[PDB]
């Protein structure tokens, strides 16, 4: 069967993974101890996708949890679903990265890179037909950006044919969490822009907005944001886990979504998102879901899609569906928003439908869009990068870890090319 191995690096990656496996395990009816207590036989039909079956019906997820400091991973052990992961997969270091890409990529993480590969290889061999790898991390952090890219380069060299998805949290436009994010992001993107096949850019600012207005949640915590990220993460892999009328695995999404190899940065979305107050007043039908997913107010990226054009779009539905409604609504969006798609691609929507809905919902959809508006995100990071690097604001920390200043300009130049390439295709033949 098709199989995936999950990698989570850093505080952001590990905490997202913890919520992600809570959602995945709940759908397949897995007890926190690892036992199976589901009701439908269709859950075990593809449980091999994520879980290795151990003796006694104890299903063990094949996830590799990496963090240069024990702190974050220690809480995962004591969490509600801590006792499901294999103890040996917790590859934790001691000296945590100081939020600098250099330390997590060259000095400290380089010592732990070999240990992680040992765990991953065992998982890859445990599979019968491995499809691809998944990485959850943040581009603004040290370990995630550093260790994540170091892992990506190494595994790519060892699994060139397979796929690797990257659910990466991206720095927010207005409010930042770390001072030196521009250096980490620019360097990290320089690695992802050539080593990963698809990326799912997410930013906390957009997720905060969704909770504030789209969900009317007064006190949102990371226990809430990570659920939306997990929900989108589960949607992308639903076809692998469950049957449907029109399926789409990870490879199918990548081929349709990526026109050119370097333009593989996407922006996800989810529907339906309704507050309990407004739940009663809204009808749950395909037409309603289509409007929300294409609404700029629901995108999980700060960049407003209306400021640019769509190269490719993918909507993965779940639950009982009507194919005619799906096609009609996609036809409406294609025509109504005439100028939001590049003409040189006659049709931009790749659809997929799964029979099983998520959790208690009777219907859901996950949105993926390869908009050119994301060029704005890279534009801002480069502007911030040049603002600091112009006079070496924080460069002595990176140079002291073995990095050379020539690398920063190479990353800057490579990043500038990506924006130029994006701008080129925003033009039209006529």
């Amino acid at each position: 069967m098709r199989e995936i191995v999950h990698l989570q690096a850093g505080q952001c990656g590990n905490q997202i993974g913890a919520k992600f496996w809570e959602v995945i395990s709940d759908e397949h009816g897995i007890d926190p101890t690892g036992t199976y207590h589901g009701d439908s036989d269709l859950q075990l039909e593809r449980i091999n996708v994520y879980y290795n079956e151990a003796t006694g019906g104890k299903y063990v997820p094949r996830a590799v949890l990496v963090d240069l400091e024990p702190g974050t991973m220690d809480s995962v052990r004591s969490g509600p679903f801590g006792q499901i992961f294999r103890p040996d997969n917790f590859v934790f270091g001691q000296s945590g990265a100081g939020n600098n890409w250099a330390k997590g990529h060259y000095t400290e993480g380089a010592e732990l890179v070999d240990s992680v590969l040992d765990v991953v290889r065992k998982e890859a061999e445990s599979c019968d037909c491995l499809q691809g790898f998944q990485l959850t991390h943040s581009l603004g952090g040290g370990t995630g950006s550093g260790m994540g890219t170091l892992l990506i380069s190494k595994i790519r060299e060892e699994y060139p044919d397979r796929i690797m998805n990257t659910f990466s949290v991206v720095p927010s436009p207005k409010v930042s969490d770390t001072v030196v994010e521009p250096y980490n992001a620019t360097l990290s993107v320089h690695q992802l822009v050539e080593n990963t096949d698809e990326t799912y850019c997410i930013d906390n600012e957009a997720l905060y907005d969704i909770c504030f207005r789209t969900l009317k949640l007064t006190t949102p915590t990371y226990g809430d944001l990570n659920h939306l990220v997990s929900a989108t993460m589960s949607g992308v892999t639903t076809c692998l886990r469950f049957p449907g009328q029109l399926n789409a695995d990870l490879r199918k999404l990548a081929v349709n979504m990526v026109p050119f190899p370097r333009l593989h940065f996407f922006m996800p979305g989810f529907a339906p998102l309704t507050s309990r107050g407004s739940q009663q007043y809204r009808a749950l039908t395909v037409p309603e879901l289509t409007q929300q997913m294409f609404d700029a107010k629901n995108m999980m990226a700060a960049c407003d899609p209306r400021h640019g054009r769509y190269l490719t779009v993918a909507a993965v539905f779940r639950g009982r569906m009507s194919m005619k409604e799906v096609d009609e609504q996609m036809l409406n969006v294609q025509n109504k928003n005439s100028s939001y798609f590049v003409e040189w691609i006659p049709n931009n929507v790749k659809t997929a439908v799964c029979d099983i809905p998520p959790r208690g919902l009777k219907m859901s959809a996950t949105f993926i869009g390869n908009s050119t508006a994301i060029q704005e995100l890279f534009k801002r990071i480069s502007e911030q990068f040049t603002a600091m690097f112009r006079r070496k604001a924080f460069l002595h920390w990176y140079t002291g870890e073995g990095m050379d200043e020539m690398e920063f300009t190479e990353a800057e130049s490579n990043m500038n090319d990506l924006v130029s390439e994006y701008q080129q295709y925003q033009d039209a033949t006529a």
Partner: protein, 431 residues
């Protein structure tokens, strides 16, 4: 996240230490006798295989008076007797004595303990150093330790909390010599220093707190909360944990500019607490006002280069972003051009604890700010002015020279200090 080692040197540092360790014990619930009537108190404590926890600290002084109080105090059982290192004769407020003559005799004894403390650590984040910028032992001996620690523990975090001389209040006549000399010997070795002035904290105790009779038991007790906020991430779990080394990576753009100032909110009396909501914006806006910062230098007179808001307690991440966003749009609050991103957020779940008999009210929500502002240059300049005003006539140089120090060292110290002032000028201007 593993051990951070605390070195308390001088009367100021030691008296701050007992306030800090009194705070540490209450947070983790360790009684005053060292017994633990769960997995995170190992950063600052060592389990003595018997249910008795020993603080991971080295208390050093050149006079038995201050450490004698601890030996006879309530926390006598807490500390390892060998850690409480004491000298015979004080440094007499002389930097040369604390560094060359009497400092050299006891330096080895301190390093012997530090090495033994370090060996029992699976991971050593760095060192905390509590000292007074002005004084004999607190400024002369710390320079020795900084030099000794650097050679043995290169590239390990060396945080220090320094009592910077107050612009107006002073308790010694030769502080400008002592303060400038120590700055010269710690600029290259120290990673970053958290600066606090006694006059600034006195002002807070009168205005924010309603205490009309504050004492050093109040300043040190309040100063202890600053260190607790800084090290809470190591000792507790929460969204956006901030390790020890993230401070030097975020708050120090240039190697020679590593003197963030301290600020803490809320600071309110019990009676005045009933009339305030103390929401995230309420406490957050206080940190950026001149009336609450713990260094008398006016922040509005300069520009910021980095800030780390160490939120704590029942706080929501969304409110943190909204409150921070409001700050950045203020025209009065200015951030240097070459640093588009200045804030380093950090959130922790454990609320601040209440010290019985203290002057601070019970708050379910608190914030601590560490900010690197160019306005601190107004503090170095006054120290520089107070130095050459005396050195031109050789006000007290004979005492320092006789203790095995050369006159040329005075000239070098000011020259290095002069460049530091120039550096803040260079970083504070952009095209």
């Amino acid at each position: 996240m593993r051990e951070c080692l605390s070195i308390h040197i001088g009367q100021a540092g030691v008296q701050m230490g007992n306030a800090c360790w009194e705070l540490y014990c209450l947070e983790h619930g360790i009684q005053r006798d060292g017994i633990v009537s769960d997995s995170s108190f190992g950063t600052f404590f060592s389990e003595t295989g018997s249910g008795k926890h020993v603080p991971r600290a080295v208390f050093v002084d050149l006079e038995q008076t201050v450490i004698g109080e601890v030996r006879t105090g309530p926390y006598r059982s807490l500390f390892h007797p060998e850690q409480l290192i004491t000298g015979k004769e004080d440094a007499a407020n002389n930097y040369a004595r604390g560094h060359y003559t009497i400092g050299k005799e006891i330096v080895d004894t301190v390093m012997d303990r530090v090495r033994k403390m370090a060996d029992q650590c699976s991971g050593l984040q760095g060192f905390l150093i509590f000292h007074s910028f002005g004084g004999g032992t607190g400024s002369g001996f710390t320079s020795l330790l900084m030099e000794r620690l650097s050679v043995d523990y290169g590239k390990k975090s060396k945080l220090e909390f320094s009592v910077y001389p107050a612009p107006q209040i002073s308790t010694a006549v030769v502080e400008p010599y002592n303060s400038i000399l120590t700055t010269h010997t710690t600029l290259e070795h120290s990673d970053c220093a958290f600066m606090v002035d006694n006059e600034a904290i006195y002002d807070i105790c009168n205005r924010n707190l309603d205490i009309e009779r504050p004492t050093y038991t109040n300043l040190n007790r309040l100063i202890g909360q600053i260190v607790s906020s800084i090290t809470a991430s190591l000792r507790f779990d929460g969204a956006l944990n901030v390790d020890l080394t993230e401070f030097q990576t975020n708050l120090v753009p240039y190697p020679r500019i590593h003197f963030p100032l301290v600020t803490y909110s809320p600071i309110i009396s019990a009676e005045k607490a009933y009339h305030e909501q103390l929401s995230v914006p309420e406490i957050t806006n206080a940190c950026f006002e001149y009336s609450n910062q713990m260094v008398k230098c006016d922040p509005r007179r300069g520009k910021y280069m980095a800030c780390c808001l160490l939120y704590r307690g029942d706080v929501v991440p969304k409110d943190v972003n909204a409150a921070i966003a409001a700050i950045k749009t203020r025209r009065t609050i200015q951030f240097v051009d070459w640093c588009p991103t200045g804030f380093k957020v950090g959130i922790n779940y454990q609320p601040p604890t209440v010290v019985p008999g203290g002057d601070l009210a019970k708050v379910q929500r608190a914030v601590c700010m560490l900010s690197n502002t160019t306005a601190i240059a107004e503090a170095w300049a006054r120290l520089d002015h107070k130095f050459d005003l005396m050195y031109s006539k050789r006000a007290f140089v004979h005492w320092y020279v006789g203790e095995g120090m050369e006159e040329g060292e005075f000239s070098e110290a000011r020259e290095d200090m002069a460049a530091l002032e120039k550096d803040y000028e260079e970083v504070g201007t952009e095209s």
